[PDB]
Amino acid sequence: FTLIELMIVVAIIGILAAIAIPNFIKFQARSKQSEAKTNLKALYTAQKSFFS
Amino acid sequence: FTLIELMIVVAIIGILAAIAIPNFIKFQARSKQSEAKTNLKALYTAQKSFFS
């Protein structure tokens, strides 16, 4: 190999350092949203038993 | 040998002192021109790496 190849190697690692991956904060927000579901279903249950 | 031969020897040395040889300054200049080639290829390489 020669100088151009080696500079391209450096440039490629520079590219990978700035890659645009998916936004996983969206995934973690969807994980955090489950509190609302569980606690609202608990509200529903408690209301039904209270009415009964 | 005689006087004519000796004078011809002197004249031949006079001729050799003024012989017309190739112009070697052109060969020196062709040697010096290699800076441009090497440095322009380095410029090309660096431009390609920067683009990448």
From Swiss-Prot, chains A, B:
A GO-annotated cellular component: membrane
Residues bearing PTM N-methylphenylalanine: 1
Disrupted gene: phenotype observed: Deletion mutants show loss of observable pili.
Statement: the UniProt record of this protein carries the keyword Lipid metabolism: no
Signal sequence bounds: none
Subcellular location: Fimbrium; Membrane
Transmembrane portions of the chain: 1-21
S-S bridge residues: none
Keywords attached to this entry: Fimbrium, Membrane, Methylation, Transmembrane, Transmembrane helix
Induction: By the two-component system PilR/PilS component PilR. In the contrary, PilS is a negative regulator of pilA expression. In addition, an increased level of c-di-GMP correlates with reduced transcription of the pilA gene. Expression of pilA seems to be negatively regulated by the accumulation of pilin at a cell end.
Function in brief: Major component of the type IV pili that are required for social gliding motility through cycles of extension and retraction. Extended pili are composed of thousands of copies of PilA and retract upon binding to extracellular polysaccharides and thereby pull the cell forward.
More about this protein: Pilin assembly limits pilus production and S motility. This limitation could be linked to the high frequency of reversal of gliding direction observed in M.xanthus. Reversal implies loss of pili at the leading pole of the cell and commissioning of new pili assembly at the other pole.
Family: Belongs to the N-Me-Phe pilin family.
Protein name: Type IV major pilin protein PilA
Organism expressing this protein natively: Myxococcus xanthus (strain DK1622)
